Enzyme design. Structure first.
Site, PDB file in Angstrom:
ATOM      1  N   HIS A 186       0.530  -1.552   0.258  1.00 41.12           N
ATOM      2  CA  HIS A 186      -0.422   0.139  -0.138  1.00 41.12           C
ATOM      3  C   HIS A 186       0.785   1.150  -0.231  1.00 41.12           C
ATOM      4  O   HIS A 186       0.464   2.253  -0.634  1.00 41.12           O
ATOM      5  CB  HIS A 186      -1.209  -0.535   1.344  1.00 41.12           C
ATOM      6  CG  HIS A 186      -1.836  -1.199   1.497  1.00 41.12           C
ATOM      7  ND1 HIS A 186      -3.001  -1.142   0.139  1.00 41.12           N
ATOM      8  CD2 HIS A 186      -1.925  -2.178   1.711  1.00 41.12           C
ATOM      9  CE1 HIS A 186      -3.367  -2.652   0.582  1.00 41.12           C
ATOM     10  NE2 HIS A 186      -2.936  -3.224   1.839  1.00 41.12           N
TER      11      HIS A 186
ATOM     12  N   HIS B 162       5.829   6.614   6.779  1.00 43.97           N
ATOM     13  CA  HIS B 162       5.552   6.835   5.484  1.00 43.97           C
ATOM     14  C   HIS B 162       4.952   7.600   4.185  1.00 43.97           C
ATOM     15  O   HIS B 162       4.786   8.984   5.028  1.00 43.97           O
ATOM     16  CB  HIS B 162       4.715   5.707   5.543  1.00 43.97           C
ATOM     17  CG  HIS B 162       3.454   6.293   6.091  1.00 43.97           C
ATOM     18  ND1 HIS B 162       3.215   5.654   7.082  1.00 43.97           N
ATOM     19  CD2 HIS B 162       1.760   6.598   5.361  1.00 43.97           C
ATOM     20  CE1 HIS B 162       1.347   5.798   7.702  1.00 43.97           C
ATOM     21  NE2 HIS B 162       1.208   6.958   6.637  1.00 43.97           N
TER      22      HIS B 162
ATOM     23  N   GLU C 144      -3.414  13.247   1.368  1.00 45.31           N
ATOM     24  CA  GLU C 144      -4.161  12.498   1.624  1.00 45.31           C
ATOM     25  C   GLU C 144      -5.141  13.698   2.529  1.00 45.31           C
ATOM     26  O   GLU C 144      -5.594  14.525   1.897  1.00 45.31           O
ATOM     27  CB  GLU C 144      -4.277  11.924   3.156  1.00 45.31           C
ATOM     28  CG  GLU C 144      -3.635  10.892   2.005  1.00 45.31           C
ATOM     29  CD  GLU C 144      -3.549   9.262   2.850  1.00 45.31           C
ATOM     30  OE1 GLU C 144      -3.950   9.077   4.203  1.00 45.31           O
ATOM     31  OE2 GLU C 144      -4.313   9.175   1.981  1.00 45.31           O
TER      32      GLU C 144
ATOM     33  N   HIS D  34       3.599  10.819   6.502  1.00 47.97           N
ATOM     34  CA  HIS D  34       3.167  10.844   8.178  1.00 47.97           C
ATOM     35  C   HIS D  34       3.919   9.698   8.639  1.00 47.97           C
ATOM     36  O   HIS D  34       4.297   8.982   8.739  1.00 47.97           O
ATOM     37  CB  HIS D  34       1.537   9.876   7.828  1.00 47.97           C
ATOM     38  CG  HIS D  34       0.773  10.458   7.039  1.00 47.97           C
ATOM     39  ND1 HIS D  34      -0.515   9.303   6.952  1.00 47.97           N
ATOM     40  CD2 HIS D  34       0.696  11.580   7.117  1.00 47.97           C
ATOM     41  CE1 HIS D  34      -0.855  10.447   6.331  1.00 47.97           C
ATOM     42  NE2 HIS D  34      -0.708  11.373   5.658  1.00 47.97           N
TER      43      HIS D  34
ATOM     44  N   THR E  79      -5.740   6.192   8.142  1.00 52.86           N
ATOM     45  CA  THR E  79      -6.240   7.146   6.173  1.00 52.86           C
ATOM     46  C   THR E  79      -6.451   6.160   5.660  1.00 52.86           C
ATOM     47  O   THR E  79      -6.986   5.929   4.721  1.00 52.86           O
ATOM     48  CB  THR E  79      -5.817   8.128   5.773  1.00 52.86           C
ATOM     49  OG1 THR E  79      -4.582   7.651   5.706  1.00 52.86           O
ATOM     50  CG2 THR E  79      -5.579   9.541   6.602  1.00 52.86           C
ATOM     51  N   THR E  80      -6.274   4.218   6.174  1.00 55.41           N
ATOM     52  CA  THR E  80      -6.400   3.843   5.662  1.00 55.41           C
ATOM     53  C   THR E  80      -7.237   2.400   6.401  1.00 55.41           C
ATOM     54  O   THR E  80      -7.537   2.700   7.476  1.00 55.41           O
ATOM     55  CB  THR E  80      -4.933   2.568   5.235  1.00 55.41           C
ATOM     56  OG1 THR E  80      -4.511   2.452   6.457  1.00 55.41           O
ATOM     57  CG2 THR E  80      -4.174   4.087   4.422  1.00 55.41           C
TER      58      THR E  80
HETATM   59  N1  LIG Z   1      -1.757   7.147   7.007  1.00 55.43           N
HETATM   60  S1  LIG Z   1      -2.404   6.463   8.169  1.00 55.43           S
HETATM   61  O1  LIG Z   1      -3.539   7.122   9.235  1.00 55.43           O
HETATM   62  O2  LIG Z   1      -0.918   7.633   8.959  1.00 55.43           O
HETATM   63  C1  LIG Z   1      -1.851   4.715   9.389  1.00 55.43           C
HETATM   64  C2  LIG Z   1      -0.695   4.917  10.163  1.00 55.43           C
HETATM   65  C3  LIG Z   1      -0.955   3.507  10.199  1.00 55.43           C
HETATM   66  C4  LIG Z   1      -1.245   2.222   9.814  1.00 55.43           C
HETATM   67  C5  LIG Z   1      -1.145   1.283  10.136  1.00 55.43           C
HETATM   68  O3  LIG Z   1      -0.132   0.824  10.424  1.00 55.43           O
HETATM   69  N2  LIG Z   1      -2.651  -0.265   9.680  1.00 55.43           N
HETATM   70  C6  LIG Z   1      -3.416   0.186  10.639  1.00 55.43           C
HETATM   71  C7  LIG Z   1      -4.136  -0.542  12.420  1.00 55.43           C
HETATM   72  C8  LIG Z   1      -3.693  -1.952  12.281  1.00 55.43           C
HETATM   73  O4  LIG Z   1      -4.604  -2.513  10.334  1.00 55.43           O
HETATM   74  C9  LIG Z   1      -3.706  -2.392  13.179  1.00 55.43           C
HETATM   75  C10 LIG Z   1      -5.078  -2.314  13.231  1.00 55.43           C
HETATM   76  C11 LIG Z   1      -5.205  -3.048  15.073  1.00 55.43           C
HETATM   77  C12 LIG Z   1      -4.148  -3.657  15.709  1.00 55.43           C
HETATM   78  C13 LIG Z   1      -2.656  -3.560  15.172  1.00 55.43           C
HETATM   79  C14 LIG Z   1      -2.266  -3.011  13.934  1.00 55.43           C
HETATM   80  C15 LIG Z   1      -2.318  -2.494  11.223  1.00 55.43           C
HETATM   81  C16 LIG Z   1      -1.670  -1.231   9.796  1.00 55.43           C
HETATM   82  C17 LIG Z   1      -1.990   2.432   8.827  1.00 55.43           C
HETATM   83  C18 LIG Z   1      -2.475   4.096   8.121  1.00 55.43           C
HETATM   84 ZN   LIG Z   2      -0.626   7.858   6.356  1.00 47.54          ZN
END
Ligand SMILES: NS(=O)(=O)c1ccc(C(=O)N2CCC(O)(c3ccccc3)CC2)cc1
Ligand SMILES: [Zn+2]
Length: 260
Positions: free
Chosen positions: A65, A95, A107, A120, A199-200
Site C-alpha cells: 500500500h 510512510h 490526503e 505521515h 486513513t487506511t
Molecule cells: N495513514 S495513517 O493513518 O497514518 C496509518 C498509520 C498506520 C497504519 C497501520 O500501520 N495499519 C493500520 C492499523 C493496523 O491495521 C492494526 C490494527 C490493529 C492492531 C494492530 C495494527 C496495522 C496496519 C495505517 C494507516
Molecule cells: Zn498515512
C-alpha cells in the site's frame, strides 16, 4: 488481515472500503480538507515537542500500500509531545502517500489544494503499552503530517529514495538503520490539529492529527522514484504504486485548531 482485499484501484478503492469497514462513514474520519480561514487559533495549545535525537530506524518495508520506515519503539527514543497532546507518543514508523502526477497525492488538502505527497510520522501513546492496544483508543495515536511539494530536492530524503530499488514489490523489506527523521522536517512547526482516524482500513478513529503548515520541497527525481514502486508482489502483473491516497472526508462535528 490475511483476507483483506482493499486497495486503491477502481474496484477496491476508497469508495468501496465502507463495505468491509463501516466506520469509513463515521463521525471522525480522515483525511479532511483544512479550510484555513475557518480553522481557529487556539492560544492554549502548548508548544509542539519533536524529540528525534535518539531515533533508531531499523528497516524499510513495501507493504503493498506504501512503504514504511520502521523504528525501534521498545524504548522512549523518538517521541512527540506537547501541542494538543497529553502524555508521550513514541515514533513507530513513517510512510508517505503520493500521486501519479505532481498535482495530486496528499490526503489532507489545504483550501482544497492537493500537494504532490504527504508524509505521515506515526506515534503511539505510551500510556497504552503498545501500538495494537493504542489503536483501540480515541487518543491512541498521534500522526504528524507533512506536505511535500515538488521543487528543490530534500537532501535528507535521498537515503530513502536510493533504497527503494531493493523493495520494489509487496512484501520486500531491507535493513534501514541510522536514518535520521529530523532531515524530513520543515523549518517551522506551526500546525493545524483535529481528532480523526487512520486513513487506511481499518480506519479506526484513534488519531490526533497534527498537520504542519509548512511543506517540505522534494525534487521531481525524488518523487519519480516513489512512482516506480509496485503495489503487486514479485512475479505478478506490474501495477505502479501511485495514487495511494484517500480523498478528503466530511468534517462533520469537528473544529480544526491552528497553533498560529
Ligand atoms: N495513514 S495513517 O493513518 O497514518 C496509518 C498509520 C498506520 C497504519 C497501520 O500501520 N495499519 C493500520 C492499523 C493496523 O491495521 C492494526 C490494527 C490493529 C492492531 C494492530 C495494527 C496495522 C496496519 C495505517 C494507516
Ligand atoms: Zn498515512
Amino acid at each position: 488481515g490475511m483476507s483483506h482485499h482493499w486497495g486503491y484501484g477502481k474496484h477496491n478503492g476508497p469508495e468501496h472500503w465502507h463495505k468491509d469497514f463501516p466506520i469509513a462513514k463515521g463521525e471522525r474520519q480522515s483525511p479532511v480538507d483544512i479550510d484555513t480561514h475557518t480553522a481557529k487559533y487556539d492560544p492554549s495549545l502548548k508548544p509542539l515537542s519533536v524529540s528525534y535525537d535518539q531515533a533508531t530506524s531499523l528497516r524499510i518495508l513495501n507493504n503493498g500500500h506504501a512503504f514504511n520506515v520502521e523504528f525501534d519503539d521498545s524504548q522512549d527514543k523518538a517521541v512527540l509531545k506537547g501541542g494538543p497532546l497529553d502524555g508521550t507518543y513514541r515514533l513507530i514508523q513513517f510512510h508517505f502517500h503520493w500521486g501519479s502526477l505532481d498535482g495530486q497525492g496528499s490526503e489532507h488538502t489545504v483550501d482544497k489544494k492537493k500537494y504532490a505527497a504527504e508524509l505521515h510520522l506515526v506515534h503511539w501513546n505510551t500510556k497504552y503499552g503498545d501500538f495494537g492496544k493504542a489503536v483501540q483508543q480515541p487518543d491512541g495515536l498521534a500522526v504528524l503530517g507533512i506536505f511535500l511539494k515538488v521543487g528543490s530536492a530534500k537532501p535528507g530524503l535521498q537515503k530513502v529514495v536510493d533504497v527503494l530499488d531493493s523493495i520494489k514489490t509487496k512484501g520486500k523489506s531491507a535493513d534501514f538503520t541510522n536514518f535520521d527523521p529530523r532531515g524530513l522536517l520543515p523549518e517551522s512547526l506551526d500546525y493545524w490539529t483535529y481528532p480523526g482516524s487512520l486513513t487506511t482500513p481499518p480506519l479506526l478513529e484513534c488519531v490526533t492529527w497534527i498537520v504542519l503548515k509548512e511543506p517540505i520541497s522534494v525534487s521531481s527525481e525524488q518523487v519519480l522514484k516513489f512512482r516506480k514502486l509496485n503495489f503487486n508482489g514479485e512475479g505478478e502483473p506490474e501495477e505502479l504504486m501511485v495514487d495511494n491516497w484517500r480523498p478528503a472526508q466530511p468534517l462533520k462535528n469537528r473544529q480544526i485548531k491552528a497553533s498560529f
